[PDB]
Design an enzyme around this catalytic site. Structure first.
Site, PDB file in Angstrom:
ATOM      1  N   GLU A  67       0.795  -1.249   0.000  1.00 45.87           N
ATOM      2  CA  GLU A  67       0.000   0.000   0.000  1.00 45.87           C
ATOM      3  C   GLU A  67       0.824   1.295   0.000  1.00 45.87           C
ATOM      4  O   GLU A  67       0.278   2.370  -0.242  1.00 45.87           O
ATOM      5  CB  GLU A  67      -0.957   0.036   1.201  1.00 45.87           C
ATOM      6  N   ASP A  76      -6.334   6.975  -5.715  1.00 47.51           N
ATOM      7  CA  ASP A  76      -5.849   5.595  -5.771  1.00 47.51           C
ATOM      8  C   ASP A  76      -6.012   4.955  -7.149  1.00 47.51           C
ATOM      9  O   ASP A  76      -6.143   5.654  -8.160  1.00 47.51           O
ATOM     10  CB  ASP A  76      -6.553   4.734  -4.707  1.00 47.51           C
TER      11      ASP A  76
END
Ligand SMILES: Nc1ncnc2c1ncn2[C@@H]1O[C@H](COP(=O)(O)OP(=O)(O)OP(=O)(O)O)[C@@H](O)[C@H]1O
Length: 447
Positions: A67, A76
């Site tokens: 991540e 994202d």
């Protein structure tokens, strides 16, 4: 700097030293990240280019790797607003909405900026939320409970990424895991929107489900080149050129030089490559030939120079050939290639193809021309001779073993890559293929 076997090069190094003795020093080629110098002789003429020479694995480290860590709000994969270690703020396009959700989670007005400790706090909460999602879910808990700790981490990872409902949808995959059918589960799992959307992460997670080890997480960003040995790669490229008589790499040797203009914290070791005059970047001449195409006789000579370059780069598996750092001279040869800047070759392993390190000459229309009979007849008698190939490996050993950091296993790895390249090139030349087809062939090693 004794070059008993090459007096021509020795005398060039003597001119270099004599120029330094009378104050004429090497100058950085580009003033910024200077690790390269134009060396001059007493008449201030450029004669050479000198280039001086406990982790803990667990779900937390695993997800940190997958991540990343941002301290400011970003977008994202899909595009939703996110911060910290993969913490989704909201589906809304409203940046103000995201800052609002953030301020609730943190307990102060962040304006979309948090600290590392606040990022880590949210991270811990999210991993806990994921484990809660798992244990409260009828399809997940039985699987989770039945798994060893490393595979349990893979499952937490999926839930963290996709959410409890999402992972619960892998009905047959989940049952396969619970029956310990690792290979089947792995295969099934790759056939998913999940995998197609984030294939590199999915691949790491699935390898973890499949092996119950951290192996997909252990060696990331180690690269495929031995560190701090560029000067030997430069010298090695010339060694390979010379043994095959390619004659496209300017003479390049390992030398020692002392100069005020170097960056010190006392002679420095490094590569010294002869400066070639009157050359332009290949890309420049390729552009010019669009309006003024080469006459057939010179088109043929250029393509045989090109084939030599291809053979060099393939054998040493150059990871850094662009169309700016092979050079072409054009007005015995009417047209000539100089293969310079060979400091990132002889990798100890083939690239993983997350980073392909392609040869940029492979994009060129020229690359689809089959290797000439000329080049094939010249080169095949060398590279298909196992004695020649052994002698080449022995020559490179003698050069490479001089570095303080030399390691025998790593060198033998370098040579099994090189021997693999040579095997593929042998077959390609026999099959009468083109440079473009050559670079398609799956990589092989010779153990
Ligand atoms: N043997 C040579 N003869 C003539 N020019 C050269 C030679 N070697 C390098 N050059 C030129 O010097 C410049 C930089 O060279 P080089 O790339 O080898 O050094 P570098 O600092 O590693 O740069 P890069 O980061 O571009 O690889 C380039 O313009 C290149 O064309």
């Amino acid at each position: 700097n004794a070059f008993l076997d090459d007096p021509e090069f020795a005398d060039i190094m003597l001119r270099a030293e004599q120029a330094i003795e009378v104050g004429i020093f090497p100058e950085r080629i580009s003033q910024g990240s200077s690790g390269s110098y134009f060396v001059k002789d007493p008449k201030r003429k450029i004669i050479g280019v000198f280039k001086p020479k406990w982790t803990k694995y667990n779900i937390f480290e695993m997800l940190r790797i997958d991540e990343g860590l941002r301290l400011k709000i970003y977008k994202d994969t899909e595009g939703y607003y996110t911060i910290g270690i993969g913490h989704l703020l909201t589906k809304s396009p409203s940046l103000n909405a995201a800052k609002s959700e953030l301020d609730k989670a943190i307990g102060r007005n962040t304006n979309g900026v948090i600290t590392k400790d606040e990022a880590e706090k949210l991270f811990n909460q999210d991993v806990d939320a994921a484990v809660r999602g798992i244990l409260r879910n009828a399809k997940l808990k039985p699987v989770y409970d039945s798994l060893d700790a490393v595979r349990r981490a893979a499952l937490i990872n999926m839930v963290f990424q996709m959410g409890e409902t999402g992972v619960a949808g892998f009905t047959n995959s989940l049952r396969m895991l619970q029956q310990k059918r690792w290979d089947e589960a792995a295969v099934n799992l790759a056939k998913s929107r999940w995998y197609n959307q984030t294939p590199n992460r999915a691949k790491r997670v699935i390898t973890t489900f499949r092996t119950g080890t951290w192996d997909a997480y252990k060696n990331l960003g180690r690269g495929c080149l031995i560190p701090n040995q560029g000067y030997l790669s430069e010298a090695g490229a010339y060694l390979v050129d010379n043994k095959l008589h390619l004659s496209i790499v300017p003479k390049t040797k390992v030398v020692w030089l002392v100069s005020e203009t170097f960056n010190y914290n006392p002679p420095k070791i490094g590569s010294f490559q002869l400066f070639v005059e009157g050359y332009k970047e290949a890309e420049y001449w390729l552009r010019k030939f669009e309006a003024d195409p080469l006459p057939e006789n010179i088109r043929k000579q250029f393509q045989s120079q090109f084939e030599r370059l291809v053979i060099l780069d393939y054998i040493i598996r150059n990871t850094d050939r662009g169309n700016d750092n092979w050079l072409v001279r054009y007005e015995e040869f009417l047209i000539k290639i100089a293969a310079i800047d060979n400091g990132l070759a002889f990798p100890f392993k083939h690239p993983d193809e997350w980073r392909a390190y392609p040869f940029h000459w492979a994009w060129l229309p020229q690359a689809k021309v089959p290797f000439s009979e000329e080049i094939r007849n010249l080169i095949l008698p060398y590279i298909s001779d196992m004695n020649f190939v052994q002698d080449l490996c022995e020559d490179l050993y003698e050069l490479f073993k001089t570095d303080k950091g030399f390691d025998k296993a790593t060198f033998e790895s370098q040579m099994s890559v090189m021997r693999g390249q040579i095997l593929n090139l042998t077959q390609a030349l026999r099959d009468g293929k083109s440079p473009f087809q050559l670079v398609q062939i799956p990589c092989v090693i010779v153990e």
